[PDB]
Amino acid sequence: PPLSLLIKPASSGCNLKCTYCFYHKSYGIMRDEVLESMVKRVLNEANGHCSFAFQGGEPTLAGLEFFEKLMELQRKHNYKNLKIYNSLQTNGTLIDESWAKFLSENKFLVGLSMDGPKEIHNLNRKDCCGLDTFSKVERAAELFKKYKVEFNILCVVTSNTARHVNKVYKYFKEKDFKFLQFINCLDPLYEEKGKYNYSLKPKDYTKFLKNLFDFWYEDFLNGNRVSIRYFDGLLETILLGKSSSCGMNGTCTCQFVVESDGSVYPCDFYVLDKWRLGNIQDMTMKELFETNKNHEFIKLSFKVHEECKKCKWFRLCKGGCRRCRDSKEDSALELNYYCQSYKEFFEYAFPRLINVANNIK
């Protein structure tokens, strides 16, 4: 089968201090021997194609020469002539001409984190000193357009986002950003939910989804296509019965998260000792996947909540992402935290989602 990895080449290391972030133990920068062992194993084991996605942490802290070495390894060690996909998620604050050229020439797909216009973005996305970052992220987008880097925007949805969907959507529209991914702001794993100023509560999320869908659909009607990852996945589920977004298919998959020391985990939300599968230097990808830890991680997500069983939306929703059901350590999974939001949203949007699905055949 193809192989897809999520790599943290600078570990959890980051140059910012975003208020909601729980991703920034740092294993430091991935060493060359780990990088080499990882790239060779993937190219030897994968069939069809493989994908390397660089995340963190701020992955550009690994430095350009790390990524240059990566490309050289891919060039030399792809004995099967697999297709290779590379991608990078970045805060954009360190992007300069050298990065933009590299990313463009090497066909990376880039995800740039931008939470909306200046005020909405800076409220949470602050630097180490507590200062603003929006202008530096705009500069990154500017460099990406200049050098034709393919990029999507990754926007975290906080309570403030829910109150200002008009400003956020209009800003991205003004900037001609056509590929958007809205990520729910999660409270830290196993903490009491909804305790922070930024916390995205179910009633905030319902409001966000309904208003976003309205702006998206009005555009659709007017022939302006805007790709919104969640709505695309619903469309996929409607037309094909499956989605290419993890969290939308009802059960978990092993994401092969590789930390900078080579340790491997099943999902970016669960880089914890109890889910450490082993080390990529010493195990095959098959062996990691077939661990008792991975099998257990996945199988836990197969439990269907009783409310879901009789839910009219079950074939559309599937219970949502396991991370949003995991309220307490080693307690069984609960109903999705956002269950009420999906129900209220589906009642509001489903007729028009079908409308769209028909028109894209």
Partner: peptide
């Protein structure tokens, strides 16, 4: 299937 924190096109 990839998670929504990773950039992807459908």
């Amino acid at each position: 299937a990839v998670p929504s924190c990773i950039p992807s096109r459908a």
